[PDB]
Amino acid sequence: MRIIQTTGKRKTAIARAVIREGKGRVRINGKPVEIIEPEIARFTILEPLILAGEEIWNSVDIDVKVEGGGFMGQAEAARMAIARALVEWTGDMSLKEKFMKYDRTMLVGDPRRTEPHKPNRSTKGPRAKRQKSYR
Amino acid sequence: RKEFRYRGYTLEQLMNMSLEELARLFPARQRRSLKRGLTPEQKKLLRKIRLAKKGKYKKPIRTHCRDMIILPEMVGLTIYVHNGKEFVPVEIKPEMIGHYLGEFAPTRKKVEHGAPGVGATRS
């Protein structure tokens, strides 16, 4: 059967998604997406499928494995991987244009990463500094 | 005013008791110290105390062992404990059992503050 693999990266989270013909079952780390918590993360994961449509959602199966990051970085990585898998599977340039217009980050990764800390209260952050006394 | 008793035992019973039972009766710190054993200086001090109790030692007892734990067999004797400069006399009493010998030889003088100096405040 036709099986397509895609990858998504957000912060320190990496998601590998496998897409094949199925009955609309989308699982993240072996768990159904419908019982994903919190609601914000569930919506983040489910947005690309809703954009793609009910028929494409129901006529395909997606399995996503995400490692690293937090509960929001993992959701973003899974969303990007699912979007890329859907575009590659459908081969629909109109769908690709719709995804690009709605949110460019779904198809194009997020380069933003943590800035390394620097002295003068390094544990607080790169730019946070100790309070000045002056007297 | 009542007869002294430590964990339900009198002074005679404490004297007849061995080291292990005394360690059991003592708190955790003293029990651990007794289980680990006495230092050679503490052993020398204990030998001097035993000789004084037997009566073949009449000179005053002085020591630098501020970490020695008071035992019931040391009750009734005056021990001069070093406090940094002098050998402060301490008369051991039954209620003093289980306390460190250095708790009764203060090393710092009481502070009686005087007038603040020129640099004490922002003036």
Binding site: - | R5, Y6, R7, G8, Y9, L25, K93, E95, M96, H99, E103, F104, P106, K110, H113, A115, P116, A120, T121
Partner: protein, 141 residues
């Protein structure tokens, strides 16, 4: 059943609109944990409202408080796990508790220990630093 607005258990007036757990905490020497332990030993519901307690339940609480160790409460949950004189495991509440604490402090002062000196002077007793904190008096100079 009969609901009493104010219930007196061990010389202390317990509230009627509060759960038994926090109601029992009004007695000096009884915290939330010990109150829960006493309720569980007595078989009373910790979450029931105080005031529904009957006389028999009150007496059961009194006898449990009188002898906690003998009633199943562990020996490591009492106020005095090893009494200085008797050597038994005792739990003291209110006047007995203040008397015991005062007696311990007085014994330290009588034997002239360092802790006794610190208690007499009112300065911190557990080896804290007094240069920048523990300032009770007013500004001088």
């Amino acid at each position: 059943a009969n609901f009493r607005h104010i219930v007196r258990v061990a010389g202390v007036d317990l509230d009627g609109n509060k759960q038994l757990r926090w109601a029992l905490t009004a007695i000096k020497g009884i915290g939330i944990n010990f109150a829960t332990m006493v309720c569980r030993v007595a078989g009373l519901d910790p979450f029931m409202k105080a005031g529904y307690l009957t006389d028999e339940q009150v007496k059961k609480i009194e006898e449990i408080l009188a002898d906690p160790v003998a009633h199943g409460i562990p020996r490591w949950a009492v106020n005095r796990p090893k009494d200085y004189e008797t050597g038994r495991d005792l739990h003291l509440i209110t006047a007995k508790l203040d008397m015991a604490i005062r007696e311990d402090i007085m014994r330290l002062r009588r034997i002239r220990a360092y802790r006794g000196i610190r208690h007499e002077l009112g300065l911190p007793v557990r080896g804290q630093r007094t240069r920048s904190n523990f300032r009770r008096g007013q500004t001088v100079g």
